[PDB]
């Protein structure tokens, strides 16, 4: 049984979009429907709630008008709506079931609420739009710990993006981190190879990359001073 | 319940206490059960009517100042209690029934209780 | 100490049975055929029959309740009943050329009636009907032309049309239970609907109470006695809906003030159908005043009766709904057989604190209803000619409390409701069903022959 | 607003403890397996309905609320979280004792030149090869934390399934002055590290 | 009627002669409270069986030839008549109603009218 | 074997059996529902 | 009435039409447009 999340998603600042919760599997009436958050490696959210019969809810003070949630009773399902998105809307989504609270009969009952039945979640992702082929940055090592070094790549879009180390000649000792969504809608990662102490000065380093979304290929020489 | 009734009479007599414990113990479709104990009462109180009508009604068992009639099968006092059962008996017993009712209901009490004003007075 | 039983004791305990309804006398004398539903409703007990109780204590829970449920299950049955006979409208999910109006009565009624032209069956088969009638804004919808609608339901559910007989009349009806059931009845004033309450009486022919129908605002209902009562079954779940009833009534005046006029369509045989007619004179929207001060007053002495809850001093607003469905979004209810929505957002826009004219709320009409969420039928609420006028006393309200993520910081209210089960657990909160048991045995030294 | 560890670890078949505080209203509990639906646990402070192991033990002591687990299966890997109405818990990481207390490594690398003079300071810290995969960091400008535009990942596998994750702090050249000591700072299993960079 | 459940059993044994008078007192949506009269008329029945099966049928008060169990809460003569209450003392009894019931509806009357047998034949 | 009087063959035989049949059916084909809307409320339900 | 043919695709005359695909007006949800629409069903459902 349980509950249809419509997929991850994309849009832009400001904006405004619409997300789809399908109940199956008992009565989208009875019972009562709430949503949840989480933004990036956040403490979830309160969202707000609709009973499904009249259609009364409760969007808690600091998200009114913000949200819209909804319902459609013979499709038997459940609506959200977001508007004026900003990058601080970054985050999971889900529709989660109550069954103590609503109408009908059959009721568990619980003095906590209860989140019986959950919907698999919807990522949703503000990317303001266009896509920008990066912009790449050298961090050197310096002044123990063998030396370690690498480049980063910032505020381009979409992902993903490949970078080698010389064609990628060199494999030992690298990582290249994952993404991350800073507030401009953009991404920013790194790659990062680590060394021997002696290493510099002899063999020296460089970054390929390539945004091949935007068609863009990249060759920076680092180097620590 | 009903445990052995191809035991013989003295044999069952010894309990009469199960049978008359679940006799009653505690839209379409739905019409009808509520037909049936319906009447399942009505043949319990039928039951109770044709008992206190009769000496009886003190519950069970009931002795009674009418006796026997010869051919009605003659036959004796330990080939029954030790040798037969209860519809074995009443089979037997269809041809009779009705003037057996009809004399317990009049013949008695209706004399016993009016002989018994004639002494509840004094 | 030997054994010895006792037929008659006072020994019952939690059980719920099937109960019957009371509506007394003067009630069965008005001729014209059939009545509310109380077809063979037995009338009431004319004296109060009671029994003070005596030292006894027991708990009430007007949630864990049932003769709500009943009631509820047993209005929607006599619903479907009322109009099961009722005339049919398969012929009405039509085209409509339609239009809107043609008179000097502001864009506060602007259109929204509308005047739709269509055909139709006749009583006989072959011919069409070419006819026209008069509709609520919220009856019709477009299409993708000049002005063809299509009625609400016809793309979820059929309907059918009330028999004129029928009046939307609630009557107070006395629920009486039968023996081996008892109703227990609260008699303190000051019990919030749970819980054990002392001062009791035994009844069994329940008052004469009217199931009025409304949302958001309560009806005609019973009063409250000194400090006005709160009832929540556990507040501090905001989804709990809070039930409020009153120990002050608020005077209110409806009117659909438009003088109407009914066609008696001839989609025969036998089955006729009500049209609206053109209007009589000026056209002004429906809508309900209410005193002033007298609400001021009464929204005072609520709000002295919440912080309580809620610290002594903490910060109160109120508003308009979180957006619901008609029913729920603003007073839905019925007067005079036909059907208002009024727009409560006038009397909430307001913050509290701690310790002149008269207001003129607009409502609008609609007459296409499928309550409680009955879908697969609907009632055409047919037409009333001449003016309609309605005095109500207004003695409880549904409320949502907002769920502010803080301590005790500003907490927020609008008028809930949507579930109408409450409407009756406002009248059932003074009531339990008991099943006695007139059997109990004691020891004691006596001993039988 | 409750509070819940930040992550816990334990070896299979042991007893553990989840605590979560807030007030004296009834929690409950429910589970995250990763891209799996939430699954609730317990409701009302201590009783274990259909469909659940008895291996589950909620109980409270007041304000605290806390579940222990009899046990440990690693199909329950995962994230867990309390409630109480409105008041939500943070979400609580709970890996397994697979293999040994990874302490980190920490890289705190400053802005290129070249950042400079493209007129936007972008400083990084850099956690590797740690496990379990659960640490968190606030970074320390002079002495001073801060809350403007911080970004950090979520970590994941290395080639060598111990992890990495990123930390990046975007401020402007003037503001990346105006403290000398700037700091990133982590905690990796109550172990706190730090590392700093001043303008040089 | 059920006036003072409150007031102690020794005052409320006065009378018991109301709760047993109103407890009759003389389409769907009909078919309901036809529904509920047929059962209140059943429970009044099961009633008056388990009190006819047992010595009692004798209406109201009926002296037993069973004494008590130690252990079913070992009590006093005053504490009850003179502190208690009605479903003060069934609540408690709740953990024993059965097997008393078992016992009276057998070990009594059928040893006891099995007995008048033996003594109702000479 | 059950005959209310087998030697009247037009009294159907009734057979049953100590031995369970295995018996495997199965309707081979992927479906798919046609919600036809023949409003209002009564919708149909057609092959697709 | 019923516009009909058979099937289109490479199952064998095991499954040699017998299937139908059917097509026909309706009954809107309102009382005036018809219905142009078509449908599946087995040969022992129709009749010539
Ligand atoms: C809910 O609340 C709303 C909002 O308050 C109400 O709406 C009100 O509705 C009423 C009726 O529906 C409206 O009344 C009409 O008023 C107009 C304008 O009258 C003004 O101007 C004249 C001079 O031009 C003044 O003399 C008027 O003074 C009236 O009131 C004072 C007291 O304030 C009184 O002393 C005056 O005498 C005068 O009253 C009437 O006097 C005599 C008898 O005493 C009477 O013959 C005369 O006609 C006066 O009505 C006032 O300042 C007025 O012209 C209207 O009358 C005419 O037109 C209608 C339409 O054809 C005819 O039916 C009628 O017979 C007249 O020919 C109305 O009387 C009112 O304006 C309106 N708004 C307000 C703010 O009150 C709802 O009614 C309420 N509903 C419910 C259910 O509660
Ligand atoms: C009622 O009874 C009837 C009659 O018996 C059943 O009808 C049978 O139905 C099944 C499925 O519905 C038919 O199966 C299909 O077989 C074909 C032909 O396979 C033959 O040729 C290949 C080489 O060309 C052989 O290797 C095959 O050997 C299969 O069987 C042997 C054992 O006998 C086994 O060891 C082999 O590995 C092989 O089995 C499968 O092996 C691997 C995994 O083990 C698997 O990946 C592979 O695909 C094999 O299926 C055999 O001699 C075969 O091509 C079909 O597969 C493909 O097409 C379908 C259609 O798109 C795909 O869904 C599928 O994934 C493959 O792409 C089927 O497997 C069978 O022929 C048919 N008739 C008989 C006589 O068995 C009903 O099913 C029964 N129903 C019920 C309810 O009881
Ligand atoms: C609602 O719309 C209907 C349309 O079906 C209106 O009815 C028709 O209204 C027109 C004018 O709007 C009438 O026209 C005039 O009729 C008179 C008398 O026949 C004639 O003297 C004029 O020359 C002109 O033709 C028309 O007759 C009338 N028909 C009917 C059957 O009513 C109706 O008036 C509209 N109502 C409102 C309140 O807008
Ligand atoms: C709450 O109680 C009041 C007080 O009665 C109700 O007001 C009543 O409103 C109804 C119509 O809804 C009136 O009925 C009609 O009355 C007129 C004249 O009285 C008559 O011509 C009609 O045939 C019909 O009987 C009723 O009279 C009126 N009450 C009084 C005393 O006049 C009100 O309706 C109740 N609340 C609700 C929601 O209904
Ligand atoms: C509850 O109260 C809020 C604010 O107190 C109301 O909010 C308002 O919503 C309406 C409709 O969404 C907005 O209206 C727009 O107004 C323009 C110009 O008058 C009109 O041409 C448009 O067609 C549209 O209706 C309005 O801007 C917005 N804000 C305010 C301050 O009114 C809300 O309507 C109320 N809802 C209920 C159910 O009471
Ligand atoms: C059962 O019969 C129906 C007839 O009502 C078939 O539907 C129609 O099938 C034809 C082809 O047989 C489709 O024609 C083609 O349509 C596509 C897309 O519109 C277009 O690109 C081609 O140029 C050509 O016109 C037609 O669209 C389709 N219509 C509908 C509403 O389905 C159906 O395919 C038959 N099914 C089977 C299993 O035989
Ligand atoms: C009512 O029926 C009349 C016919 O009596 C309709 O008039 C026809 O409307 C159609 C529109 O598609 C035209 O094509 C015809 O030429 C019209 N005249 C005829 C048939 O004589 C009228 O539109 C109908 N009105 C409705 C359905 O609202
Ligand atoms: C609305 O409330 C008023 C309160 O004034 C009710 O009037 C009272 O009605 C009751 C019963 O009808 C009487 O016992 C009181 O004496 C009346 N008050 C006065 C001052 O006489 C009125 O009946 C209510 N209307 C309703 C409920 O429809
Ligand atoms: C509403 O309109 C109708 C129809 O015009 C009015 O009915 C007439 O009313 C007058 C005055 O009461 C009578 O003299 C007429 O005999 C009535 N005729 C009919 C056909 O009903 C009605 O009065 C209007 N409403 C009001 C409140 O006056
Ligand atoms: C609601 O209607 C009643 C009755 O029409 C109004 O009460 C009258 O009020 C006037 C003054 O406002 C008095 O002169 C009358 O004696 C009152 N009569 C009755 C029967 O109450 C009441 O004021 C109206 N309230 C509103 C807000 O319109
Ligand atoms: C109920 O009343 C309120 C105000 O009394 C209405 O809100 C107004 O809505 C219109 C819609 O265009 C806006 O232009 C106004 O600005 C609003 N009022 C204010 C004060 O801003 C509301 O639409 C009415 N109806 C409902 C259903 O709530
Ligand atoms: C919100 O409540 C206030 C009352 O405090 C209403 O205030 C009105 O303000 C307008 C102009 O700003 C005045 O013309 C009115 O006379 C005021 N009325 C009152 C009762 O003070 C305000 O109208 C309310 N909002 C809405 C939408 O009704
Ligand atoms: C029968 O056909 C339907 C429709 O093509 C299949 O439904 C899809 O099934 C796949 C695999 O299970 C899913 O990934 C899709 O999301 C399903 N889509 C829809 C719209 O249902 C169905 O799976 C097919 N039958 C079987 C046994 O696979
Ligand atoms: C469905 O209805 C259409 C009309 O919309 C029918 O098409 C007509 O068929 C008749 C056959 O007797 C022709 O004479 C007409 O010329 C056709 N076109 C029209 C009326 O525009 C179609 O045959 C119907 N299909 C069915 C009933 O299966
Ligand atoms: C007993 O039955 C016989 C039948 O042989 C009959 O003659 C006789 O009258 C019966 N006894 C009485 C008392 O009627
Ligand atoms: C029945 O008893 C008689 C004596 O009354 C005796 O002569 C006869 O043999 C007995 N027969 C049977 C079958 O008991
Ligand atoms: C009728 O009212 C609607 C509502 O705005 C409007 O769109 C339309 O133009 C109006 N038509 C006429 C003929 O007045
Ligand atoms: C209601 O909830 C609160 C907090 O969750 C709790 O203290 C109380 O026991 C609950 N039940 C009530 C008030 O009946
Ligand atoms: C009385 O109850 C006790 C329980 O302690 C039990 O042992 C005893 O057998 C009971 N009396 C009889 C007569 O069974
Ligand atoms: C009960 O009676 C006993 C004597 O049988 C006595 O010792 C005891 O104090 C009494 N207690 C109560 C509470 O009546």
């Known amino acids: 049984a349980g509950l249809m999340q419509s997929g991850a998603v994309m849009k832009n600042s400001g904006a405004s979009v619409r997300v789809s919760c399908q109940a199956d599997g008992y009565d989208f009436i009875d019972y009562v429907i709430h949503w949840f958050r989480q933004r990036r490696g956040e403490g979830l959210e309160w969202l707000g709630w609709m009973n499904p019969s009249g259609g009364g809810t409760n969007y808690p003070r600091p998200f009114q008008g913000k949200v819209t949630m909804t319902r459609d009773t013979s499709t038997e399902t459940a609506y959200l709506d977001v508007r004026g998105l900003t990058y601080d809307d970054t985050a999971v989504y889900y529709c989660?079931?109550?069954?103590?609270?609503?109408?009908?009969?059959?009721?568990?009952?619980?003095?906590?609420?209860?989140?019986?039945?959950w919907g698999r979640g919807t990522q949703i992702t503000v990317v303001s739009a266009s896509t920008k082929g990066p912009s790449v940055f050298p961090l050197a090592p310096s002044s123990g710990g063998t030396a370690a070094l690498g480049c980063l790549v910032k505020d381009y879009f979409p992902e993903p993006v490949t970078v080698s180390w010389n064609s990628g000649a060199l494999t030992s000792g690298v990582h290249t981190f994952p993404a991350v969504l800073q507030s401009s809608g953009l991404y920013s990662l790194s790659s990062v190879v680590t060394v021997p102490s002696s290493s510099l000065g002899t063999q020296t380093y460089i970054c390929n990359v390539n945004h091949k979304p935007s068609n863009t290929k990249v060759d920076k020489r680092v180097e620590p001073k | 319940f009903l445990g052995a009734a191809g035991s013989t009479m003295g044999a069952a007599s010894m309990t009469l206490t199960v049978q008359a414990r679940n006799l009653l113990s505690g839209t379409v479709w739905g019409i009808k059960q509520l037909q049936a104990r319906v009447l399942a009462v009505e043949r319990y109180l039928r039951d109770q009517q044709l008992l206190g009508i009769w000496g009886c009604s003190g519950k069970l068992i009931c002795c009674t100042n009418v006796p026997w009639n010869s051919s009605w099968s003659n036959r004796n006092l330990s080939e029954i209690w030790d040798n037969m059962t209860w519809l074995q008996w009443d089979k037997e017993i269809s041809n009779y029934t009705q003037i057996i009712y009809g004399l317990l209901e009049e013949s008695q009490n209706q004399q016993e209780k009016n002989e018994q004003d004639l002494l509840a007075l004094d | 100490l030997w054994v010895t039983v006792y037929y008659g004791v006072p020994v019952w305990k939690d059980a719920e049975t099937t109960l019957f309804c009371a509506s007394d006398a003067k009630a069965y004398e008005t001729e014209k055929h059939n009545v509310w539903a109380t077809h063979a409703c037995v009338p009431t007990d004319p004296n109060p029959q009671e029994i003070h109780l005596e030292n006894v204590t027991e708990e009430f829970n007007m949630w864990k309740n049932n003769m709500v449920e009943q009631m509820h299950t047993d209005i929607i049955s006599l619903w479907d009943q009322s109009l099961k006979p009722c005339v049919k409208l398969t012929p009405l999910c039509v085209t409509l050329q339609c239009t809107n109006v043609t008179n000097n009565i502001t864009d506060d009624m602007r259109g929204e009636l509308k005047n739709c032209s269509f055909n139709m069956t006749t009583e006989l088969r072959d011919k069409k009907q070419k006819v026209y009638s008069l509709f609520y804004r919220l009856d019709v919808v477009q299409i993708n032309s000049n002005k063809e609608y299509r009625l609400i339901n016809c793309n979820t559910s059929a309907i059918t049309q009330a028999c004129p007989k029928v009046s939307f009349e609630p009557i107070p009806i006395h629920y009486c239970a039968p023996a081996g059931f008892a109703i227990l009845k609260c008699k303190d004033k000051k019990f919030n609907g749970t819980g054990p309450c002392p001062s009791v009486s035994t009844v069994q022919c329940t008052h004469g109470i009217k199931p009025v129908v409304s949302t958001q605002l309560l009806l005609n209902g019973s009063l409250a006695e000194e400090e006005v009562m709160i009832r929540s079954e556990n507040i501090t779940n905001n989804a709990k809906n809070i039930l409020v009833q009153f120990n002050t009534p608020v005077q209110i005046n409806c009117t659909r003030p438009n003088n109407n006029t009914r066609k008696s369509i001839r989609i025969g045989p036998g089955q006729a159908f009500y049209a609206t007619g053109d209007i009589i004179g000026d056209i002004r929207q429906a809508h309900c005043n209410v005193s002033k001060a007298t609400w001021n007053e009464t929204l005072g002495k609520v709000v002295k009766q919440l912080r309580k809850h809620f610290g002594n001093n903490t910060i109160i607003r109120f508003a308009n709904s979180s957006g619901g469905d008609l029913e729920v979004t603003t007073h839905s209810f019925n007067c005079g057989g036909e059907f208002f929505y009024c727009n409560t957002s006038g009397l909430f826009n307001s913050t509290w604190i701690s310790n002149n004219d008269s207001i003129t709320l607009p409502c609008r009409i609609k007459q296409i209803i499928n309550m409680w969420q009955r879908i697969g039928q609907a009632m055409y609420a047919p037409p009333i000619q001449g003016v309609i006028r309605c005095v109500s006393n207004i003695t409880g309200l549904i409320l949502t409390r907002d769920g502010g993520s803080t301590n005790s910081t500003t907490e927020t209210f609008r008028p809930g409701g949507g579930d109408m089960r409450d409407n009756w657990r406002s009248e059932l909160y003074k009531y339990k069903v008991v099943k006695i048991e007139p059997l109990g045995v004691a020891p004691t030294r006596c001993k039988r022959r | 607003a409750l509070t819940q560890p930040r992550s816990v670890s334990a070896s299979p078949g042991q007893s553990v403890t989840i605590s979560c505080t807030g007030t004296h209203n009834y929690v409950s509990w429910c589970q995250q397996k990763p891209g799996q639906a939430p699954k609730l646990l317990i409701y009302d402070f201590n009783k274990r309905p259909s469909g659940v192991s008895d291996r589950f033990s909620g109980s409270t002591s007041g304000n605290t609320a806390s579940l222990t687990i009899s046990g440990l299966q690693a199909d329950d890997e995962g994230h867990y979280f309390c409630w109480a109405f409105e008041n939500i818990g943070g979400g609580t990481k709970l890996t397994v004792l697979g293999q040994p207390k990874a302490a980190p490594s920490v890289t705190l690398f400053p802005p290129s030149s070249e950042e400079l003079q493209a007129n936007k300071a972008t400083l990084v810290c850099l956690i590797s090869d740690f496990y379990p995969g659960a640490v968190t960091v606030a970074w320390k400008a002079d002495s001073s934390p801060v809350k403007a535009g911080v970004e950090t990942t979520t970590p994941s596998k290395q080639s060598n399934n111990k992890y990495a994750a990123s930390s990046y702090l975007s401020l402007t050249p003037e503001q990346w002055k105006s403290h000398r000591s700037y700091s990133c700072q982590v905690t990796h299993e109550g172990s706190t590290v730090e590392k700093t960079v001043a303008p040089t | 009627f059920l006036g003072a459940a409150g007031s102690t059993m020794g005052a409320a044994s006065m009378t018991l002669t109301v709760q047993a008078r109103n407890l009759l007192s003389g389409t769907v949506w009909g078919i309901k409270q036809l529904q509920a009269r047929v059962l209140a008329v059943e429970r009044y029945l099961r009633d008056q069986q388990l009190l006819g099966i047992w010595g009692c049928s004798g209406k109201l008060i009926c002296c037993t030839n069973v004494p008590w169990n130690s252990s079913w809460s070992n009590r006093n003569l005053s504490e009850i008549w003179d502190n208690m209450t009605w479903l003060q003392w069934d609540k408690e009894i709740s953990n024993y109603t059965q097997i008393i019931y078992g016992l009276l509806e057998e070990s009594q009357n059928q040893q006891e009218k099995n007995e008048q047998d033996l003594l109702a034949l000479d | 074997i059950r005959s209310e009087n087998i030697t009247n063959n037009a009294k159907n035989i009734l057979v049953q059996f100590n031995t369970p049949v295995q018996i495997n059916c199965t309707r081979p084909n992927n479906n798919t529902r046609k919600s036809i809307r023949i409003g209002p409320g009564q919708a149909f339900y057609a092959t697709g | 009435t019923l516009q009909c043919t058979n099937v289109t695709n490479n199952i064998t005359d095991d499954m040699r039409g017998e299937l139908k695909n059917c097509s026909f007006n309706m009954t809107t949800e309102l009382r005036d447009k018809k219905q142009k629409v078509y449908s599946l069903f087995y040969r022992l459902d129709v009749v010539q």
């Open positions: 989660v079931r109550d069954r103590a609270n609503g109408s009908g009969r059959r009721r568990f009952e619980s003095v906590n609420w209860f989140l019986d039945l």
